[PDB]
Amino acid sequence: MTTFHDLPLEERLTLARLGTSHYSRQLSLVDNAEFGEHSLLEGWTRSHLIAAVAYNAIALCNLMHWANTGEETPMYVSPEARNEEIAYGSTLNPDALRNLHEHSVARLDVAWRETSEDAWSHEVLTAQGRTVPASETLWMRSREVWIHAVDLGAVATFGDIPEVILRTLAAEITQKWTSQGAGEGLVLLDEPSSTRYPAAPGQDEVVVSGSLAGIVRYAAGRGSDGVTSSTGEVPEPPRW
User: Fold this and answer.
1) Which of 7, 118, 210, 227 lies 20 to 30 Å from 196, alpha-carbon distance?
2) CA distance 219 to 222
């Protein structure tokens, strides 16, 4: 069971594009009058979310420009500028936002298509300070669209997400917790495939199990409906 990272570039691009079309189908289902409503993500109106996704596309465009020119161009100007722009974007009218999403998507795809072979392996920095090859943007964008498609609150689910992406997410989230010493003793279990995704080590083990879609929804902090606990009580997972 390979991860997204070991897939050929073309398959990674296809998954990012499929995720975007999936996300866009959900956005199409949301009515303009519903943009001001809460998303399924706590603390985000749909407008905030929609804007954030577009700004993520622009941010990934920056990394691809850095990769293709060799000139450093960070994802975001600063943490502040980031939030301030999302705040601005969230105020725009529904159609302006739909146009921003559409155009930002189109521009990122062009950036990927015109990227050179060497550029794909060019080293860049993510907003979280990670040093990765430019190709990482294919994964970063897939992570964004496939998951936020669910947050839009139309009909998308974690079950809709290709297994290779869910597996990669299960590993990434728990690896992140581990690196930060979070989730001592907590272990996610993909029961059908008998695959454990442990967090930081601890004396008291607590296994949260279910289907892959179930444990990823749980780990991503979007609900425990798809899982059960070995102690009879599902604890709140570390934040992500």
Assistant:
1) 7
2) 7
